Write a structure and sequence with these properties.
heterotetramer; A: about 10 residues; mainly beta; B: about 90 residues; OB fold (Dihydrolipoamide Acetyltransferase, E2P); five-stranded mixed sheet; 1 helix; about 5% helix; about 40% strand; Autophagy-related protein 16-1 (chain A); RB1-inducible coiled-coil protein 1 (chain B)
Chain lengths: ~10, ~90, ~100, ~10
């Protein structure tokens, strides 16, 4: 479901 | 923190930290609940948290977690341009 | 002061004190601006304060509390559309950008 | 005189 976004760290 | 202090808490409006009290509002333009802020950056309420706050697709909540995210598709759940950076916040009831 | 900061002002929600940052909203059923609060008590904005807030009888603004007076309605018809005998506060405020 | 100040 978190396909339209990416977590950036 | 102490009990008195926990009662006398105030609403954070920027630089959100775990434990902050926040005001959550529906942002119809972005098809999501957001934290009320005076910052230009968007802080979305994580889908996982809507039931915890008695929400179903304002309320007060306490920040539990935050994640920094970028939109990787132009059509996305947040109705933001490709490449927009924003936060997603998990919150619990106050 | 745009970078991450620990001592930013936060919005008061009850037991309002001089200097508190507050969220001022229109209360439809009283045709008056009020402080956002979790208190059961009504906190009405003083009429003297609307020009300093760019308000005319718009949704919301941020202000700073300058004064609060505890009041009672003495007539059934009154400026706040509250029942006779209601106790409430009247709050003077200025714009958030005053120190 | 529609309202009265109790304490200021």
């Amino acid at each position: 479901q978190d396909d339209d976004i990416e977590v950036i760290v | 923190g102490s009990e008195f202090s926990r009662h006398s808490e105030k609403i954070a409006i920027r630089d959100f930290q775990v434990g902050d009290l926040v005001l959550i509002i529906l942002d119809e333009r972005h098809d999501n609940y957001v934290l009320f802020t005076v910052s230009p950056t968007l802080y979305f309420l994580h889908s996982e948290s809507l039931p915890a706050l008695d929400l179903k697709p304002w309320v007060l909540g306490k920040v539990m977690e935050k994640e920094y995210c970028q939109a990787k598709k132009a059509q996305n759940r947040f109705k933001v341009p490709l490449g927009t950076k924003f936060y997603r916040v998990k919150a619990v009831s106050w």
